[PDB]
C-alpha cells in the first residue's frame, strides 16, 4: 500500500512525504513504522503500517476528488444553525474529521460568510487553517504548485 516518496495525506496536517519504512522494533516485535514528515510544523511522524488506516493516513486524492469537492464547493442551498456556537462546534468537528469533502464544505461556507458579513478572529483563524490544509491537499493532488493552487481555488470560489 505504502512506498517511499509517496506524497501521502494525513489528518490534520495535510499531505506529507514518507521518508523510509522504519523497522524500529518494540518488545522484540519489528513493527514496520514509516517516518513521515510535513512541511508546515516541521515534524516527523512514525506510524505502524498495520493501524496506519486506523489512525487514518490516506492516499492523495484523484480527479473524481477535485470536481467532487468542487461540486461541493459549488454546491448551493447550504445553511447552518442560527446560534453560531452550534455552527462553530459543528464545523469544528467537520474540520476535525479531515475528510476532503467536509473541509471543502467548511471553507466554501466560511467563504460565503466572510464575503457577506465580516466575521470574527476565531472564525478567521478557522478559515485560515482549513484553507491552508485544503490548498496543500489540492496542490499535491493535482501537483500544481501551492501559489498556483491558491489562485485556482480563488478562481473556483467566485464560480
Amino acid at each position: 500500500i505504502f512506498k517511499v516518496g509517496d506524497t501521502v495525506v494525513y489528518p490534520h496536517h495535510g499531505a506529507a512525504l514518507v521518508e523510509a519504512i522504519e523497522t524500529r522494533t518494540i518488545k522484540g516485535e519489528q513493527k514496520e513504522y514509516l517516518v513521515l514528515k510535513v512541511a508546515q510544523g516541521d515534524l516527523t511522524v512514525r506510524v505502524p503500517a498495520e493501524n496506519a488506516e486506523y489512525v487514518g493516513v490516506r492516499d492523495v486524492v484523484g480527479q473524481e476528488g477535485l470536481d467532487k469537492v468542487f461540486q461541493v464547493l459549488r454546491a448551493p442551498h447550504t445553511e447552518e444553525p442560527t446560534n453560531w456556537s452550534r455552527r462553530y462546534k459543528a464545523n469544528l468537528e467537520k474540520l476535525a474529521s479531515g475528510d476532503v469533502n467536509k473541509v471543502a464544505e467548511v471553507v466554501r461556507d466560511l467563504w460565503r460568510r466572510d464575503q457577506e458579513r465580516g466575521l470574527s478572529a476565531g472564525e478567521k483563524r478557522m478559515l485560515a487553517k482549513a484553507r491552508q490544509i485544503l490548498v496543500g491537499e489540492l496542490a499535491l493532488a493535482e501537483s500544481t504548485d501551492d501559489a498556483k493552487a491558491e489562485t485556482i481555488l480563488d478562481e473556483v470560489l467566485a464560480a
Partner: protein, 49 residues
C-alpha cells in the same frame, strides 16, 4: 519527552547589546517528542524554548 538542548549563535555581539540595551542572549532549541501509547506514534519537533 524532551532531549538534546542546543544553542544557536548569539543574535548580537557584546558591545552592540550593551549600547542598544539588548540583553546578550542566545536561543534554546529542544527536540521535543510526543508519543501516544494506544495507537503508537512519535511526534518529534525542534521547539524554540
Amino acid at each position: 519527552s524532551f532531549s538534546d538542548p542546543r544553542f544557536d549563535d548569539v543574535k548580537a555581539p557584546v558591545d552592540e547589546c550593551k549600547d542598544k540595551d539588548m540583553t546578550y542572549a542566545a536561543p534554546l532549541f529542544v527536540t521535543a517528542e510526543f508519543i501516544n501509547n494506544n495507537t503508537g506514534e512519535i511526534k518529534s519537533q525542534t521547539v524554540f524554548m
